[PDB]
Amino acid sequence: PVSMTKTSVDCTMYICGDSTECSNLLLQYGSFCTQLNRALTGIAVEQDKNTQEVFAQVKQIYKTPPIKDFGGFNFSQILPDPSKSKRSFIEDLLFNKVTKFNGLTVLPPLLTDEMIAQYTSALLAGTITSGWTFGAGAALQIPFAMQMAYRFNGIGVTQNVLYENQKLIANQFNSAIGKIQDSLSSTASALGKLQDVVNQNAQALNTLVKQLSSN
Amino acid sequence: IRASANLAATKMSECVLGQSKRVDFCGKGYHLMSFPQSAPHGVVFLHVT
Amino acid sequence: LIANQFNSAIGKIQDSLSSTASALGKLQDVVNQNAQALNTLVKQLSSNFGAISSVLNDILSRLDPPEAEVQIDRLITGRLQSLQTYVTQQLIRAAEIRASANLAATKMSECVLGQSKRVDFCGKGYHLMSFPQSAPHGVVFLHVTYVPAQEKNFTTAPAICHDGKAHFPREGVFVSNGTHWFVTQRNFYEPQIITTDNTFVSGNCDVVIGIVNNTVYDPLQPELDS
Amino acid sequence: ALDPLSETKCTLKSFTVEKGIYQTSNFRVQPTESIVRFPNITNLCPFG
Amino acid sequence: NVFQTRAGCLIGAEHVNNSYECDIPIGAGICASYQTQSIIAYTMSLGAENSVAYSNNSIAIPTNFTISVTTEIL
Ligand SMILES: *[C@@H]1O[C@H](CO[C@@H]2O[C@@H](C)[C@@H](O)[C@@H](O)[C@@H]2O)[C@@H](O[C@@H]2O[C@H](CO)[C@@H](O[C@@H]3O[C@H](CO[C@H]4O[C@H](CO)[C@@H](O)[C@H](O)[C@@H]4O)[C@@H](O)[C@H](O[C@H]4O[C@H](CO)[C@@H](O)[C@H](O)[C@@H]4O)[C@@H]3O)[C@H](O)[C@H]2NC(C)=O)[C@H](O)[C@H]1NC(C)=O
Ligand SMILES: *[C@@H]1O[C@H](CO)[C@@H](O[C@@H]2O[C@H](CO)[C@@H](O)[C@H](O)[C@H]2NC(C)=O)[C@H](O)[C@H]1NC(C)=O
Ligand SMILES: *[C@@H]1O[C@H](CO)[C@@H](O[C@@H]2O[C@H](CO)[C@@H](O)[C@H](O)[C@H]2NC(C)=O)[C@H](O)[C@H]1NC(C)=O
Ligand SMILES: *[C@@H]1O[C@H](CO)[C@@H](O[C@@H]2O[C@H](CO)[C@@H](O)[C@H](O)[C@H]2NC(C)=O)[C@H](O)[C@H]1NC(C)=O
Ligand SMILES: *[C@@H]1O[C@H](CO)[C@@H](O[C@@H]2O[C@H](CO)[C@@H](O)[C@H](O)[C@H]2NC(C)=O)[C@H](O)[C@H]1NC(C)=O
Ligand SMILES: *[C@@H]1O[C@H](CO)[C@@H](O)[C@H](O)[C@H]1NC(C)=O
Ligand SMILES: *[C@@H]1O[C@H](CO)[C@@H](O)[C@H](O)[C@H]1NC(C)=O
Ligand SMILES: *[C@@H]1O[C@H](CO)[C@@H](O)[C@H](O)[C@H]1NC(C)=O
């Protein structure tokens, strides 16, 4: 999970909606609601800061070239689909596996879902063409068959393991991605964590609403 | 959530923008790379190990 | 050059700090939030909470104990509820600082006392080393980072054939300036003639993708001929 | 209640306000008529 | 001079076709700022777009560097 639903609550109308006689009595309780309304505001801003830090780690929005000659590596399921919201295939499944007049409003997030997908296109665009370098400085295009041979060099595996096994590893990685789709496609229990965040928040508000019925 | 975001922010920092050498930080095994994929109210990684 | 770049780099920190008061927003927020917390906490004493007056002494002067105890109770449950909120606010806020300190305690442990390899842990770029500096209720780091600057395109190939064997760079990657093939380290263009001491042999040409023909120099042959 | 700048000053309890977006009040349409309805009985009630 | 945004009905601001960095967040990717003067609202920039000249046989290797000093506060 990254961000909560940016809930916002109005103190007075939740408590004394459309009532002068009730709002006055609330005023004798001093700054209680100005505190509450402040705290939820503090949460609300932090949520956009959360999303800002998680995704917006890269300065320039990169784009992959039309050439997909990645030495056999097939990303087409994780790169954005130009033919749709420019979201990747695997992204869509994720969106699809996940699911009032009393002052309980929701503020929309600063970075919208289409906006996010641009970042996650860049981070993927820098990752495939440029390697790690686009984080430390100027993004340097690297042939992808090269880049693995650095990553294998990064876990104590000599370069020549990759190229002598380039074809197999490609198929394994390509096949690897596919099973993710089936795993994601088959079960909605894969996304329990994110679902849990929404359900708790839904319950919290749901509980919050019901208290209006109590004597 | 806030702590998870930083862990996420950390993960995409070391594990996407680089190749982390912290065992069991980018999934079981010797880490290679990872790709983020967006998600409603969260992020999803595909750690290639 | 590296000396001058670091010295000048230090100087700009002064100006950014000297001019921009908002460079220290984080610490200022900590004080401001607490200052807000206390002031709100103080102000509640003025609230009636339904009591006939918010001045505790006033009630006792005006009412006999049988009735004043009711009014006093009203103030008590209110103000006590106010401390409850304030104390609770502090605890959560304390933990937020607590993670910050531990993170700070961390950053001085890896980044200061050593050279972290966690990218973006020690500021943008490959990390070198860092300094702490004290500050009100917090610490400030001056991460010294290595960021490459000027690039040149080159044509590459993951391996080269000398006698049909595949050669690979022991450390670095192959490049060419168009007519001659060069191996160079990864983060600073520094060519060297490709020789046996730079590269190790593995397999043969018929498997590698993108391997290209070249000539690998042998240091030993001239010694033998001479 | 002078203008939306004055509202922000009143809410922030200050005469100076920084850059940003401030939640200050709540738009509410006011009622325009008064409707009073009861079933038409004409029988005077026999409390007598 | 009224702009309709996904977050609501924005009054007082000119809508602008260009993109800039966010100065005041509004919602739905809309960010406002005070510029020469009036209040403008626009679709916030994600930064300058930068394609990368990827290919299967091209390498981009720095020939010069910098040492920068970054201030980070906790
Ligand atoms: C219980 O009994 C009370 C006693 O009344 C008798 O018993 C009941 C059962 C009835 O049968 C009643 O008719 C009996 O007389 C009873 O108190 C009575 O309540 C009625 C209704 O509220 C009163 O009638 C009112 O009459 C006045 C007239 O006032 C002028 O004359 C009187 C005479 O004494 C002067 O004192 C005044 O100064 C005035 O000069 C009306 O003004 C009034 O308002 C409207 O009525 C007339 C038409 O009736 C309209 O034209 C006016 O414009 C007003 O719109 C009432 O009509 C009656 O006076 C009163 N009795 C006494 C002795 O005061 C009670 O209501 C019964 N029920 C209960 C308690 O539930
Ligand atoms: C990458 O994989 C995708 C699917 O995993 C490939 O798209 C398939 O292409 C074949 C034609 O060869 C079609 O019959 C399928 O229906 C396509 N599937 C989908 C989901 O679109 C794509 O061709 C692969 N690309 C490379 C370069 O290997
Ligand atoms: C690529 O680099 C090589 C350096 O090895 C250049 O070759 C040298 O060029 C100088 C300039 O006249 C000559 O004096 C040397 O004798 C050359 N060396 C050899 C071994 O022939 C070459 O010119 C460069 N080419 C390009 C296109 O940059
Ligand atoms: C590197 O040079 C060798 C020659 O030493 C090339 O070998 C030739 O390969 C072609 C293609 O199969 C054959 O038709 C020729 O007969 C080979 N030459 C000889 C002398 O037998 C090899 O192709 C070169 N490599 C590259 C990548 O160009
Ligand atoms: C690497 O870059 C640095 C600056 O980033 C260059 O240093 C400058 O060199 C010029 C020479 O044209 C001098 O006039 C400047 O005074 C230098 N700057 C500093 C701060 O000393 C350096 O020349 C570059 N080196 C290479 C090989 O490109
Ligand atoms: C390499 O070539 C591409 C081709 O478009 C160009 O955009 C890029 O600036 C070149 N790199 C350098 C360092 O000149
Ligand atoms: C790169 O791709 C081109 C096709 O545009 C192909 O002719 C060439 O052989 C490829 N080279 C390598 C090293 O993959
Ligand atoms: C942007 O330009 C289009 C013309 O392509 C125009 O229709 C639209 O009104 C412009 N919007 C603004 C805010 O200038």
Side-chain angles (χ1 to χ4, degrees), chain A residues 200-214:
Chain A
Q200 289 182 32
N201 294 148
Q203 288 181 0
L205 278 71
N206 190 1
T207 298
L208 184 58
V209 169
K210 280 164 35 57
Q211 307 284 357
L212 293 169
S213 69
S214 293

Side-chain angles (χ1 to χ4, degrees), chain A residues 34-58 60-66 68 70-81:
Chain A
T34 300
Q35 188 62 27
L36 318 171
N37 174 25
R38 184 178 299 159
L40 292 172
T41 305
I43 278 179
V45 174
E46 184 177 71
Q47 304 299 320
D48 292 331
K49 181 52 154 33
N50 290 344
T51 306
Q52 194 78 34
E53 292 182 351
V54 174
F55 297 111
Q57 307 254 9
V58 59
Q60 303 176 324
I61 301 303
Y62 294 98
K63 291 182 179 176
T64 67
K68 303 297 185 291
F70 297 130
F73 289 72
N74 186 350
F75 293 114
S76 74
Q77 297 178 357
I78 59 171
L79 290 169
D81 189 338

Side-chain angles (χ1 to χ4, degrees), chain C residues 35-86:
Chain C
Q36 289 285 349
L38 271 73
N39 287 338
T40 58
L41 175 58
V42 174
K43 293 204 193 31
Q44 319 295 130
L45 298 169
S46 72
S47 295
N48 286 332
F49 296 96
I52 194 166
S53 178
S54 67
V55 176
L56 185 54
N57 293 348
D58 169 80
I59 303 166
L60 294 170
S61 293
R62 287 171 56 177
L63 308 179
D64 56 343
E67 320 311 302
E69 65 183 1
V70 177
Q71 303 301 353
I72 298 166
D73 183 72
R74 205 65 83 69
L75 289 175
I76 301 299
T77 187
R79 291 172 176 176
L80 179 56
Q81 186 174 19
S82 181
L83 279 167
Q84 283 313 349
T85 299
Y86 163 67

Side-chain angles (χ1 to χ4, degrees), chain C residues 69-123:
Chain C
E69 65 183 1
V70 177
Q71 303 301 353
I72 298 166
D73 183 72
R74 205 65 83 69
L75 289 175
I76 301 299
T77 187
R79 291 172 176 176
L80 179 56
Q81 186 174 19
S82 181
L83 279 167
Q84 283 313 349
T85 299
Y86 163 67
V87 172
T88 299
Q89 292 300 315
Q90 293 289 96
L91 288 173
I92 294 94
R93 193 178 297 112
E96 178 185 356
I97 306 300
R98 184 50 212 283
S100 296
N102 298 340
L103 173 59
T106 301
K107 282 175 183 286
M108 221 185 307
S109 295
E110 293 83 3
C111 205
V112 180
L113 270 62
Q115 178 185 19
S116 166
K117 296 181 181 66
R118 304 163 65 180
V119 288
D120 199 281
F121 199 37
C122 290

Side-chain angles (χ1 to χ4, degrees), chain B residues 13-27 29-36:
Chain B
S13 296
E14 293 83 4
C15 195
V16 183
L17 277 67
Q19 177 175 19
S20 175
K21 314 193 61 154
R22 295 160 64 180
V23 295
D24 189 359
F25 182 76
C26 294
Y30 308 98
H31 178 50
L32 285 179
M33 68 181 72
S34 62
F35 311 126

